[PDB]
Amino acid sequence: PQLHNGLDFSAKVIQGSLDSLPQEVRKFVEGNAQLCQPEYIHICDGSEEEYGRLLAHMQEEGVIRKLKKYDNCWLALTDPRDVARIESKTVIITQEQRDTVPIPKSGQSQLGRWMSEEDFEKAFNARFPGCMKGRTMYVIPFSMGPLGSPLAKIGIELTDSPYVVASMRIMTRMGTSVLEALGDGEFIKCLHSVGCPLPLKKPLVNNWACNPELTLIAHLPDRREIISFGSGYGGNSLLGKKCFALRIASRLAKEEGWLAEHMLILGITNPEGKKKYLAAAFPSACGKTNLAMMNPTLPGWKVECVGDDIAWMKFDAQGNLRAINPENGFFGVAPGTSVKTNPNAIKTIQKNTIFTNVAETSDGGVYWEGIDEPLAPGVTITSWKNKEWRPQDEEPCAHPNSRFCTPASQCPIIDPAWESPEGVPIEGIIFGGRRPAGVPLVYEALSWQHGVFVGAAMRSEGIMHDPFAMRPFFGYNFGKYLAHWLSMAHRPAAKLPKIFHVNWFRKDKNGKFLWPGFGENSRVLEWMFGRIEGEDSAKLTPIGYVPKEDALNLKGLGDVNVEELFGISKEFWEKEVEEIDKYLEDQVNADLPYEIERELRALKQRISQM
C-alpha cells in the first residue's frame, strides 16, 4: 500500500493506536504528522490516569506548578507576550470578503477580519512545515455539548501543547468515548501549534512556548477547518471554545436554522418553585460569569448555572427555543472574583482547577486583585511575573486577563439539566454591557424586531460597540447575522423569548456606581420573571418598557438613587440614535436589513415626541 513506509506514523505512537481511529481521523492525524513532523503521537483517551501523568510531566518540566494549598490545583505562568485571545491575529478565510464581513465605508471593519485563500496558503506554508519537530502531537477527540446529544458537534484537535490537552479535558468532553460516538461521522478539523520546533530558534520565556511574531488564528469554514499558530493561550489555543463553538458554529447555525452565541444560560426558580431559563449576552469583561453563577440576595429565590459563556440554541418541534451549553467547564476571569462578587465560583475552583497568570501566596494558595481576602501577617506574594510583590507596587499581582479553568460539574449550583441532551427551554434573552451614562438598569424590548435592534446597539464600554457581544466572534457577515435573527420571527409556531436590556454600570457624576449589582441583580431577574408571566409591572417609555414605580423590590437598598438610575433623558437618547446611525452606516451599510433601519427610525421618532 506504500513504496517505502508511506504516511504511516505507527512507529511514533506512544499512546493508543492509529488502527483504532475512524478512517477520516487517521487521515487527518497522519497528514498533519507528515507536515508538522512531531517526534511522538499521543492519542488522548481522556482517562484520569492519562491526566495525572500529563500533569506530572508538566510539573517535572516546570511548565506548571502544583498549588499545595488546594486539592489537585495547578498554576501556569505565561510569556507576557501571550496573555489573551488576540483579535488582530484572528482571521476568517472565504472566497469573497463580503461573505465574511460587511465592507466598511472608512476602510476598516470592526466586525471581523478577512484573509484571502491565497494569502492564507502563503502564511500557512511560512509556519506549519516541521513546526512540531522534537515535540509530541496530542490528538484530542472532543465533543462540544453532551456526548450523543442531537445538538452536540465533535472536533479533533491536534496540538503540541500538554497545557492545551489538560485545559481541553476540563472545558470539553474529551477522550475514547468521543471517538466511539464519532464513528465514521463528520468532525471539525482543529490544528494547533505553539510554533516553536526543537531545537529552539529563540529563547523560551517562563517555560512558555509561543511565537508572537507569527501568531495567526485562522478559520476556513468552507473546509470545516480551524488552524491556529503561535499562541498557547485561551481562545487562541482551546479551539473548541471560540473558534469552533462561536465562529465556525455561527455560520453552520445560519445555514441550518439555529443560533450559536456568546451567552450564559441560567435557571432561575421563584419562591413558588416556578423555574424558567434565561440566556444573556454580555461582552467580554461585562460580567456573564457573575450572573451565570449568581447567589441571589432575595429570600427564597434560586439561581442555577447551565453555562457561563457560550449557548447553542435551536427551536424544537413545539416551538420552544432550546439551549445547550457546548462547554464542559468554566474558563473564567480570576481577578475581581470574591466571596462578594461570585461566591459560587470561589467554591468551584478550590479543586481540580488550573489557574493561568494569577499570583501565588507563600503557603501555595492563589491571589489576585479584587479577591477581597486579607492575608495573615508574614504570608508573601509571588506575582504572575514570578517575582516578589507587595500591595504597594505599581503593577498588579495577577494579569488582568488571568483565568481559572474549572470543571462545570463541581459548581455547587450547577443546573440539574446542564447536560440534558434536548437543552433547556429559553423564555427570556438579556442583552447588556457597560454604559456609564444614559441607559437605565433594565428595559424590555417592544417586539422581536426592536429586540434584535437592541442587541445590535449593545456596548462593551460606554464608547465601544459590541453588537450581541459577538464583535470578535462573527463567523460571517454581521448584516446577514441580523437578517438571520430577524428571520426567527417568521418561524411558524415559534415561542419567541422576551428580550431585555440591562445595565449594571450606570454611574453618577462623581464616577460612582448607582446600582450595587452582583447578588442584588436578583431583583432585576425577579422583574423579568414576572414580565414573562405577563404581570402588569411595566411602564412604556420611548426606549421600551421599564419597571413601574414600586415594581422592583428595593427593600434593603434604601440608599439607591432611583431618579438617576431609572432616568431617561431626551438629550442623551438623541445623541445615542445619531451614534447608532453613523455606526451602522459606516460598518454595515449595504448589508443592513430593512427591519433594523426601521427600528432605528422608530426609536428616533419616539425620542422626537419627548
Ligand X SMILES: Nc1nc2c(ncn2[C@@H]2O[C@H](COP(=O)(O)OP(=O)(O)OP(=O)(O)O)[C@@H](O)[C@H]2O)c(=O)[nH]1
Residue 167: CB minimum distance to ligand X, A = 14
Q: Which position among 286, 305, 397, 411 bears the catalytic label?
A: 286
Binder among 149, 284, 352, 503 for ligand SPV (CB under 6 A): 284
**287 marked as binding residue:** yes
Nearer to Na ion among residue 356 and residue 460 (C-beta): 356
Coil vs helix vs strand at 356? strand
Nearer to Mn ion among residue 56 and residue 464 (C-beta): 464
**138 marked as binding residue:** no
Which position has the grid cell 431559563? 277
The 8-class DSSP code of residue 246 comes to I
Binder among 175, 234, 455, 547 for ligand SPV (CB under 6 A): 234
Q: Binding segment for Mn ion among 289-297, 476-484, 488-496, 523-531 (CB under 5 A)?
A: 289-297
Let me know if 305 is a catalytic residue: no
Nearer to ligand SPV among residue 153 and residue 241 (C-beta): 241
Secondary structure tally for the chain: helices H, strands E: 16, 32
Is residue 239 within 8 Å of 141, Cβ to Cβ?
Answer: no
Binder among 82, 157, 309, 599 for Mn ion (CB under 5 A): 309
Determine which helix (DSSP H) or strand (DSSP E) holds 5, and give its type and residue range.
Answer: none
> Choosing among ligand SPV, ligand X, Na ion, none, which partner's interface includes residue 206 (Cβ < 5 to 8 Å by kind)?
Na ion
Closest CA to 356 of 207, 234, 205, 240: 234
- Would you report the helix, strand and coil content of the chain in percent, each value rounded to 5? 30, 25, 45
Q: Which of residues 265-284 bind ligand X (CB under 6 A)?
A: 282, 284
5: CB partners within 8 A, 6+ apart? 11
Residue 502: CB minimum distance to ligand X, A = 9
Binding mask 100-129 for ligand SPV (x = CB under 6 A): ------------------------------
Binder among 65, 85, 247, 276 for ligand SPV (CB under 6 A): 85
**231 marked as binding residue:** no
CA distances from 302 to 155, 264, 321, 326 (A): 35, 16, 22, 23
Q: Provide the residue type at 495 as one letter.
A: K
Closest CA to 243 of 155, 178, 308: 155
> Choosing among ligand X, Na ion, Mn ion, none, which partner's interface includes residue 207 (Cβ < 5 to 8 Å by kind)?
Na ion
CA distances from 169 to 237, 399, 470, 524, 537 (A): 13, 24, 25, 36, 46
**520 marked as binding residue:** yes
Closest CA to 189 of 142, 149, 230: 142
d(CA 467, CA 453): 9
Is residue 18 within 8 Å of 29, Cβ to Cβ?
Answer: yes
Q: Cell numbers at residue 456, please?
A: 445590535
Q: How far apart are the first and last CA of the chain?
A: 79
- 285 contacts ligand X (rule: CB under 6 A): yes
**401 marked as binding residue:** yes
Q: What is the largest CA-CA distance in the chain?
A: 83
- 331 contacts ligand SPV (rule: CB under 6 A): yes
Q: Which of residues 292-321 bind ligand X (CB under 6 A)?
A: 309
- 157 contacts ligand SPV (rule: CB under 6 A): no
What is the β-pairing status of strands 90-93 and 216-220? parallel
- 288 contacts ligand X (rule: CB under 6 A): yes
Nearer to ligand SPV among residue 26 and residue 85 (C-beta): 85
User: Alpha helix (H) ranges present in 428-561?
Assistant: 448-456, 478-487, 522-532
Binding mask 296-325 for ligand SPV (x = CB under 6 A): -------------x----------------
Coil vs helix vs strand at 302? strand
Cis amide prior to 377 (ω within 30 degrees)? no
Determine which helix (DSSP H) or strand (DSSP E) holds 383, and give its type and residue range.
Answer: none
Residue 331: CB minimum distance to ligand SPV, A = 5
Count of C-beta atoms within a 10 Å radius of residue 558:
7
What is the β-pairing status of strands 188-193 and 225-229? parallel
- 286 contacts ligand X (rule: CB under 6 A): yes
Residue 40: CB minimum distance to ligand X, A = 33
User: Which residue sits closest to Mn ion, CB atoms considered?
Assistant: 289
- 235 contacts ligand SPV (rule: CB under 6 A): yes
Nearer to ligand SPV among residue 50 and residue 308 (C-beta): 308
* Adjacent-strand bridge partners of 299: none
> Choosing among ligand X, Mn ion, ligand SPV, none, which partner's interface includes residue 85 (Cβ < 5 to 8 Å by kind)?
ligand SPV
Nearer to Na ion among residue 56 and residue 540 (C-beta): 56
Determine which helix (DSSP H) or strand (DSSP E) holds 193, and give its type and residue range.
Answer: strand 188-193
Residue 566: CB minimum distance to ligand X, A = 16
Binder among 159, 215, 237, 289 for Mn ion (CB under 5 A): 289
**Separation of CA 31 from chain center:** 30
Q: Which residues bind Na ion (CB under 5 A)?
A: 77, 206-208
**135 marked as binding residue:** no
Q: Which of residues 428-487 bind ligand SPV (CB under 6 A)?
A: none
- 241 contacts ligand SPV (rule: CB under 6 A): yes
Q: At CA 59, angle to CA 54 and CA 61, rounded to 5? A: 100
Q: Which of residues 108-167 bind Mn ion (CB under 5 A)?
A: none
Q: Cell numbers at residue 141, please?
A: 477527540
Is residue 380 within 8 Å of 362, Cβ to Cβ?
Answer: yes
Q: Binding segment for Mn ion among 12-20, 41-49, 283-291, 377-385 (CB under 5 A)?
A: 283-291
Provide the annotated active-site residues. Answer: 286
Binding positions for Mn ion, rule: CB under 5 A: 288-289, 309, 332
Binding positions for ligand SPV, rule: CB under 6 A: 85, 234-235, 241-242, 284, 309, 331
Binding residue numbers: 85, 233-235, 242, 262, 284-290, 309, 401-403, 434, 518-521
Binding residue numbers for GTP: 285-290, 403, 434, 518-521
Binding residue numbers for Mn(2+): 242, 262, 309
